[PDB]
Amino acid sequence: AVKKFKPYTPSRRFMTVADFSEITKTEPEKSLVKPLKKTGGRNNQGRITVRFRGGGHKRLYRIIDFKRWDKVGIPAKVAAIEYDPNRSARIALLHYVDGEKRYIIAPDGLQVGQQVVAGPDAPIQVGNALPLRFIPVGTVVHAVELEPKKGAKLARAAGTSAQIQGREGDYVILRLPSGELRKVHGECYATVGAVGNADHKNIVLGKAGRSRWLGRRPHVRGAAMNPVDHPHGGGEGRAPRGRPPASPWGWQTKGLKTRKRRKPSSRFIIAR
Amino acid sequence: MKRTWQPNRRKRAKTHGFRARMRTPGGRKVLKRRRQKGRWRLTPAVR
RNA sequence: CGAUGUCGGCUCGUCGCAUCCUGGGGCUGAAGAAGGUCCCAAGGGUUGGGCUGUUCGCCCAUUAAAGCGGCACGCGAGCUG
RNA sequence: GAAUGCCGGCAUGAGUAACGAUAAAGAGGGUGAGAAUCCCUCUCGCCGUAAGCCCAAGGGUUCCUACGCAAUGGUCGUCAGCGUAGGGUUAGGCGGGACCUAAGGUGAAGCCGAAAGGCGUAGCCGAAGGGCAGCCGGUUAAUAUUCCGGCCCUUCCCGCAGGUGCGAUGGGGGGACGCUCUAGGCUAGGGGGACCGGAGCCAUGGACGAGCCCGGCCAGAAGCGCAGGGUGGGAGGUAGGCAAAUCCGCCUCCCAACAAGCUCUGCGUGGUGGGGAAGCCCGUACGGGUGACAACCCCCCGAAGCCAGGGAGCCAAGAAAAGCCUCUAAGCACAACCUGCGGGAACCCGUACCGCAAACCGACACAGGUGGGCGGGUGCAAGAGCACUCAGGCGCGCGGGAGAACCCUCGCCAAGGAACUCUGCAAGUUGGCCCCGUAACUUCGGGAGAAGGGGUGCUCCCUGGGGUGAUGAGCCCCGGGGAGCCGCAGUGAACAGGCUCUGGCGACUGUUUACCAAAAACACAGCUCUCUGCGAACUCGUAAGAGGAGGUAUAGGGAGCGACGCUUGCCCGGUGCCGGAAGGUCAAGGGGAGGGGUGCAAGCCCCGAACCGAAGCCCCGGUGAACGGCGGCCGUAACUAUAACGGUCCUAAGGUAGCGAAAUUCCUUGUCGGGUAAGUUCCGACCUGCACGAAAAGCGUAACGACCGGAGCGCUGUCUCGGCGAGGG
RNA sequence: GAGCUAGCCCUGGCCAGGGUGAAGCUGGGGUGAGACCCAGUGGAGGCCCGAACCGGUGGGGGAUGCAAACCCCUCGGAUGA
């Protein structure tokens, strides 16, 4: 349940902050993990590439175990649920009985002291990683690989979930959070359970401040630019965009599909 | 009000310096053009 | 067109008369008072506000009257804008 | 002889404008060929969270002294930041380097590019960040944490003395961190004192008095003392920390739970060293002496600074590396490393001076700009605000008279109060604190400082709380009640809201046309559409590579709308986009019916129709919070008027809700109603909407606005309608 | 050529003094348990007044200027985009 404010100043009657009750008494982070400073940058080697980024609070990166085949059959116990500012979801600190400490994406219902195992064994309960080959049909799964032994690259944001629908030979088909039925390999590891912190959907920023704090700089409409800047720009008061709506670079923005149709990955995709 | 020339030995040396001219092939001709006409100073005198 | 600043207001005026008043006068369908119209007459005077950027105009309260025009639609090396 | 010609010279305006903040000068005396302008003294004025001190950048001899005044100085000049010459900058501890890393730059391996060159892991470079050992005084005309004096430290290298498995750029810990609010004890700084030490002074009516005036400090090893920060100690087992570890990490019983103990700071006191006024006397620009054998004590206020890696709360979740401690690997365990002592060795660069400005950036000795620290006292509730004033520094490098117009900047005014005017533009009224008291509306926060009021000084009396002192006096912080005094007036000077009612737009804080526009424009939280399943879409680049992102549909891009409430209607005919293994057309290519050129012929060379031939287009469907569009003419009801009703025509469908003479209305100052004595503006209505209308959104909406309009109260030189006075010209 | 200007990255600094008083904590109340209501504490916020600081709203001055954007009064923000 996201916690709300009273209108003692404007832009707090709408502002909403996430419930931080599941974050246990581990508010500062864990060294020997998180060894990296995050490189702040909006631009590649010079020019800006993705527009309207900059500012925002300073962040240290938490390194996350997406390769859960490192520790097959080696259990761990959850000792912390922590805040990762690099992500929409929360992270969980695993103490392996092996002795090594690792961060993981924190699923829904995962509580502290619960132990979690990875591998072909490690029964079907939240937090455990298995290959998609062994997980029963109809179960809910996150942290899914698309190709085996390349890293978890699916169903990682808050509240997201992928559902196993069936098998075709050595491939398993998944309903992805978009609704796309994608046919991904059987040996791809994937962590059972939904992601959780699904209330990230409901948080209202209240003001421009919380966007600037997250590094979202003000987005400028093409209607208010000039014909040298944007296709929509120019004219006297509030031109109605005078053409099929386009990007600053000319490509149309409403309906024009932009994936390569000749992709080799198109014969693994079934739905929207 | 604040004007254009806000001096800095660091900036002047690292921008208009001999070791900066010698990196780029464009700045190498700046030295060629100045030696061939007889400039007493190929570089802004930075101290 | 190698530059003649444009409306309106303000300040300062000055001139024409085909005269709004005051002065003189003929006719009147002028009894008297108040009028009408025409002639002589410019010496002087020709209000304060509401609306509008406005000139003009419509109003309000008066007045002897609340005149029309010219002067680069007088006047920005005088003002405003 | 002309080209607003080029170059140089000299004229006119003209002894005219000006001489650079209205902080302000007067006299006496020196020097001097020459003094308003240089030096000295007395008097006056100005700054004083600076116009005063200390740094950094930048400037580069401007610093000090001697001799000088051609030019520089907006005048003069004996003066100078000016000319000639000489002198002056002293570091193991300050800053930087023989240390480290951040962004970024660079770059062996590697990738890429016609060439030049573009990337790029490790590494290297890269600093107000991390690390690291000096405090107090005195000397020079000019340097000092640099020289000197006292006290105190840091690295090495070489020796002896005592310990231990020693030992890496490798493993681990630590370094190491946000914002806001803050608790305890200190310190910096400050106020008072009958106490202590001092030259001196009793003036002009009074005072020989706990009188006046001035001063009552600084640093300081170990040891203590007081605050405070960091840390648990054993045993096993151990697959992880890319070899190995006894170290770290993970389990499992035992022992404390705590600063008890180990360190580590800070602050006092500490052997001892040093400083030390006012006033008086002199040979200088400047300092010297005595005052002193100086005293060097006690209270109170007290930080934003210290203990510091303190605590609490919150979300927007808060550098890296080296030094440092520990662990082992080669090797080595005669080596080596640790602790204590002794001796010796400690290099390079900066160091003057200006430094909110006459020395920097503005062509100028330019009213502009320039980052960090100290920035005293008194009063006003507080405060870096305001007024005066310590220390300190200035009177701004043209002056002297006059007392016109006119101008700037001021001050005041009879009666009237906006009649001024585009507009109360400007100017004025209000103005601090305490206490009453406060409407519609409201999103229940607000609106609110609504509005509108009252008290404000001084003296005397009684009396309630705290803080530091022991519960007490004292010093300080807040209060309550009573009785009186004076003036026109008590925030007695300076700093310090005019208020209300009602509309438009925009929700709001915010951004914008450096240098005529700050807005109703932009942005904004939030809504919707659409693309993108990850070597994502999109963006830069030929490429490599990179952003997106060390992200993964609750994510990322693009587009529009722009809090919030109630809503967003019909048209897919044309355009865009989306979906259609049919069909038509369709280029290269395949294919060869058939024909041509040469050969004596094998042959060689040309064309060349059926037919097979993609995307695209045509065709078929869909789609509006995609581009867009959303009718005309007639007649009809109990008087007149109008038309709920009907007829016909066309369209892809013919504007629904909600608004409406509006930021939209031409005719138009439309017509009614309200405000006025009078209202082309304003407000409320009607609807004949030239030419509103639903995300280029529609209608509303509390709060908000240096936005735009209308009105009213208070007040006023805006005006009737001017007058007087002041200072700079 | 980014020593002016715009944006972003790395690393430091600055924001006197007052007001208002959100969440949360303690106690009392309420209930069958709650919701919730009271005080006391607490000190939130692109909150309020207002210096430094950052701007540049209205007017006046300036116009071969002190100044190729200045000066005076007035004014906005001033813990945050």
Place this chain on the structure above:
RNA sequence: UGGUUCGUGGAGCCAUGGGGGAAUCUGGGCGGACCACCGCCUAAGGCUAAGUACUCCGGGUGACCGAUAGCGCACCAGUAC
């Protein structure tokens, strides 16, 4: 595709980026599509003086200048600024 006078032209020759792809004297290219005849050369490796171009440099000469001319500089000029 480029070069050549050749801009697709009857478009050869000479180089080529792309696809297919031989032969060794009875072998191969060329003589401006092409075919026959008649002739000329012998590709898919390389080197090679001299004659030719220029004038930082020294000399000779000038119906060249003579300090606003002649080089931007006759002068300590690529200086001051």
Place this chain on the structure above:
RNA sequence: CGCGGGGUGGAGCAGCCUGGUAGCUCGUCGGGCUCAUAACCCGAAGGUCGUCGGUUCAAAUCCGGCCCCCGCAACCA
């Protein structure tokens, strides 16, 4: 004052470009159905094609002139 569309039976539209034909729907008139009306069924009439000319053998039709009606335009100072 300009540019281009239109005036056709009582109403609303066709027919014009390509001349010899004026058609559609409603309405009017007469008769059916009903008890009567509306609805419906059957059968009829009705147009100087805005006026003035000239073109042709012949004009709603083609060409000019006026009178009406509709739409756009009327800018830069």
Place this chain on the structure above:
RNA sequence: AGCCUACGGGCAGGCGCCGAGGGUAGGGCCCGUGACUGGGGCGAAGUCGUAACAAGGUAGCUGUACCGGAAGGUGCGGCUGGA
């Protein structure tokens, strides 16, 4: 600073609180009134349609929601005052 007939007294007079009332400012309730506007009742033979009463020719009524010149229609659920 006055006047008194028996004076550490009396009167006149002065000051102070309260004070009817007048003024200023903001609220509460009520009454009249206003261009225009909503709906109501009645009125004469007006216009449009036929919703309900007979299975009223679509059984009716209802709460709600949306739409339509208007009765009204339709969606969801309910009722017997219907079969």
Place this chain on the structure above:
RNA sequence: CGGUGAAAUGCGCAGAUACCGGGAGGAACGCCGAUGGCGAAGGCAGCCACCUGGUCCACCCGUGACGCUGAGGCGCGAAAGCG
């Protein structure tokens, strides 16, 4: 092929309708079923488990008048509607 009183719109030679096989998803639970049952009403239906309330019978065991109603308040409250 759909559909109807009859038709039309519509769907389909791009391969519809009818048939088979597999897959996805959502809603409601046929037969039992009733003139039934349960609940204070609204209302409640495939099956399983857990947590849970009301209620009936016998035995006449204990308390022993603790009882009835109920303005307020409080909770529940079909369908439609709202975030």
